[PDB]
Design goal:
Largest sheet of chain D: 5 strands, mixed
Protein name (chain C): 26S proteasome non-ATPase regulatory subunit 14
Strand content of chain D: 5-15%
Order of helices and strands of chain B: HHE
Bound molecules: zinc ion
Oligomer: part of a larger assembly
Number of helices of chain B: 2
Strand content of chain B: under 5%
Family (chain C): Belongs to the peptidase M67A family. PSMD14 subfamily.
Distance between the termini of chain D: 83 Å
Order of helices and strands of chain D: EHEEEHEHEEEHHHH
Number of strands of chain D: 8
Chains: A mainly beta (about 55), B mainly alpha (about 55), C alpha/beta (about 290), D alpha/beta (about 290)
Number of helices of chain D: 7
InterPro entries (chain C): JAMM/MPN+_dom (IPR000555), JAMM_MPN+_peptidase_M67A (IPR050242), MPN (IPR037518), RPN11_C (IPR056263)
Helix content of chain B: over 70%
Largest sheet of chain B: none
Enzyme class (chain C): hydrolase
Helix content of chain D: 40-55%
Structural class of chain B: mainly alpha
GO molecular function (chain C): endopeptidase activator activity; K63-linked deubiquitinase activity; metal ion binding; metal-dependent deubiquitinase activity; metallopeptidase activity; proteasome binding
Structural class of chain D: alpha/beta
């Protein structure tokens, strides 16, 4: 529940932790998130969209 | 030689007796170093990593 | 034509400034300047270390502003910092701590004043948090290729200089590019202030606050850890029921890398917290 | 407003530098340094700091010397190299709170935002936590005294984020980590009585002295809450807690069964190998 598996767009997969600010609401699977190069922390998520939806 | 073995042997009594607190120090300190190096090699294993096959 | 055995003294000032500068060690090239005092030939001591503003060009001689450098150095001269510059440092993330042509060119240009010209490259990006081993770099004379490379006496510390034994950078680029040993120094004020400061950093405010928290959590939260601990204990005893068959058949050789002993010893160590804190509750209840 | 603060050891080692660059002149007064931090978030986080030449007078206490150009130049260049940290307050190394600190802090109350104050000791002989966060806020008093600057104690913690833990751990090579178990627990359980004994014994003596030999109101109103909370535990007869001693002592019995049984399991390999190894090595030695 604290640390899960992430899938990067480039192809290699990683595992990250949980930031003390965010909660487990958006941490549920199936939601695209964002990561950091240092410590692989999570600042916020990334809501999906489409091309014609814009 | 017959009676000198007592007082001559007392030096071996002291030389072997002095090793007690010494081996106490080694057995009490080298395990502290064992948990020092143990936690040092344990903390190397970090959660952020790449998954292969 | 003379050479000695130099050694760079590194205190906690330059170390912690290179650790905060390593936290600010973004992939973009950074600049820094080291200060100190030259007392003799074969010793060098660093005291003052500050950072420099980043630039789009990166590490270069053009990025070093002489009016800004001399201005800040003058503001250090009007204060209690009467030390001259001794060298410049930077960060090389990713591609290794080695020095490119630009770095050796600005090193050749910056070594005209100071004959020593200490160079340090910090790289905490790919370095694990277990070791903070840092190395200082030096520039060799191009005219010494005919004679011996490094006529440095006291070859004992080279065994301590052999710790960075990467098989590509040190002797992969060791030609015209060598290094120097690094030692530390700590007085009693740093020892007791930083030692008691770190022990207090792992201790409480009044040191009596969080004791009863665990002494009374032994009855609420640790009970779950004791039941789960017994679940692991029985979960190993279910195999320890099968162990006397193999031990009653072969008795020769060991094939299972699991010891089944030290883990249970650790379980007993975690279980002894109740015993050690029972006397604590006895003291809190008593007086 | 602010519940707790976070002070990194870098500023206190910069106080070690304050004690290093003295030059053996014979002054060693309360050198004031410009504390820096992050006032954006509710929690305060000190990353680094610097100093300013500060000199007082021998007799007159109201003399204080600061600098605005040096503060704007060091803060301007520091903001140019790192704009993520801004001015927050200051701190002095003197162990005693002088009256002039309201005027010294008043300058950074006018020009800078609400400054936090930190009192430390010149000699690291105090076993307690050297850092005490004192917020500079004006509070209304019930006795009717005019409103003045009041220094309320804010709790503080000494922690390092990424690198200073590694640097301190490498420079010490003597301190130990958490290491739950026998030694780290029993050391706290041995020296804790002195950790409270030096604090309480060091405080109640001057307290009892200022009880009878005290004037210039020391806020005697809080003494009623002091003795009140001290009298909130009137030597309970332990009648109701007997069953709690049966519960904790029953957990003690659980630890007894775990120790005896598990150690009895550990005796297997020892009390077997001691025989099968000695008798076979002996019978096969010759
Ligand atoms: Zn580069």
């Amino acid at each position: 529940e604290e640390k899960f598996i992430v899938k990067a767009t480039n192809g290699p997969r990683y595992v990250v932790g949980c930031r003390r600010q965010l909660d487990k609401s958006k941490l549920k699977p199936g939601t695209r998130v964002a990561l950091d190069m240092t410590t692989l922390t999570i600042m916020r998520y990334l809501p999906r969209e489409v091309d014609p939806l814009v | 030689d017959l009676y000198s073995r007592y007082k001559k042997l007392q030096q071996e009594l002291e030389f072997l007796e002095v090793q007690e607190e010494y081996i106490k120090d080694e057995q009490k300190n080298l395990k502290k170093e064992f948990l020092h190096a143990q936690e040092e090699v344990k903390r190397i294993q970090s959660i952020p990593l790449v998954i292969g096959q | 034509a003379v050479d000695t055995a130099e050694q760079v003294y590194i205190s906690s000032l330059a170390l912690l400034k290179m650790l905060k500068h390593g936290r600010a060690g973004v992939p973009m090239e950074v600049m820094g300047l080291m200060l100190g005092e030259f007392v003799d030939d074969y010793t060098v001591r660093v005291i003052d270390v500050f950072a420099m503003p980043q630039s789009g060009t990166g590490v270069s001689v053009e990025a070093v502003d002489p009016v800004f450098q001399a201005k800040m150095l003058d503001m250090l001269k009007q204060t209690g910092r009467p030390e001259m510059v001794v060298g410049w440092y930077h960060s090389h993330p990713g591609f290794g701590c080695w020095l490119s042509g630009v770095d050796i060119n600005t090193q050749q240009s910056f070594e005209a004043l100071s004959e020593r010209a200490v160079a340090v490259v910090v790289d905490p990006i790919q370095s694990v948090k277990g070791k903070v081993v840092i190395d200082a770099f030096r520039l060799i004379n191009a005219n010494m290729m005919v004679l011996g490379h490094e006529p440095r006496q006291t070859t004992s510390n080279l065994g301590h200089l052999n710790k960075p034994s990467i098989q590509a950078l040190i002797h992969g680029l060791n030609r015209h590019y060598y290094s120097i040993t690094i030692n530390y120094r700590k007085n009693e004020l740093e020892q007791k202030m930083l030692l008691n400061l770190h022990k207090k950093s792992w201790m409480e405010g009044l040191t009596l606050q969080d004791y009863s928290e665990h002494c009374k959590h032994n009855e609420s939260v640790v009970k779950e850890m004791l039941e789960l601990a017994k679940n692991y204990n029985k979960a190993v005893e279910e195999e320890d029921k099968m162990t006397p068959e193999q031990l009653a058949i072969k008795n020769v050789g060991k094939q299972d890398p699991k010891r089944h002993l030290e883990e249970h010893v650790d379980v007993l160590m975690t279980s002894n917290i109740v015993q050690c804190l029972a006397a604590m509750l006895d003291t809190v209840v008593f007086k | 407003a602010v519940q707790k603060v976070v002070v990194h050891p870098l500023v206190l080692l910069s106080v070690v530098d304050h004690f290093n660059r003295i030059g053996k002149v014979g002054n060693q007064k309360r050198v004031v340094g410009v504390l820096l931090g992050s006032w954006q978030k509710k929690v305060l986080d000190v990353s680094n700091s610097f100093a300013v030449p500060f000199d007082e007078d021998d007799k007159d206490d109201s003399v204080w010397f600061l600098d605005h150009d040096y503060l704007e130049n060091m803060y301007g260049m520091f903001k140019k190299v790192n704009a993520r940290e801004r001015i927050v307050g200051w701190y002095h190394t003197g162990p005693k709170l002088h009256k002039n600190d309201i005027a010294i802090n008043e300058l950074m109350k006018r020009y800078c935002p609400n400054s936090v104050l930190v009192i430390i000791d010149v000699k690291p002989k105090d076993l307690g936590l050297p850092t005490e966060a004192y917020i500079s806020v004006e509070e209304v008093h019930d006795d009717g005294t005019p409103t003045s600057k009041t220094f309320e104690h804010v709790t503080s913690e000494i922690g390092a984020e990424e690198a200073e833990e590694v640097g301190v751990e490498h420079l010490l090579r003597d301190i130990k980590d958490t290491t739950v178990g026998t030694l780290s627990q029993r050391i706290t359980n041995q020296v804790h009585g002195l950790k409270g004994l030096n604090s309480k014994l060091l405080d109640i003596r001057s307290y009892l002295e200022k009880v009878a030999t005290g004037k210039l109101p020391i806020n005697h109103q809080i003494i009623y809450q002091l003795q009140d909370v001290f009298n909130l535990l009137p030597d309970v007869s332990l009648q109701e807690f007997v069953k709690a001693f049966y519960l904790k002592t029953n957990d003690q019995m659980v630890v007894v069964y775990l120790a005896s049984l598990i150690r009895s399991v550990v005796a297997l390999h020892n009390l077997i190998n001691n025989k099968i190894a000695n008798r076979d090595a002996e019978k096969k030695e010759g």
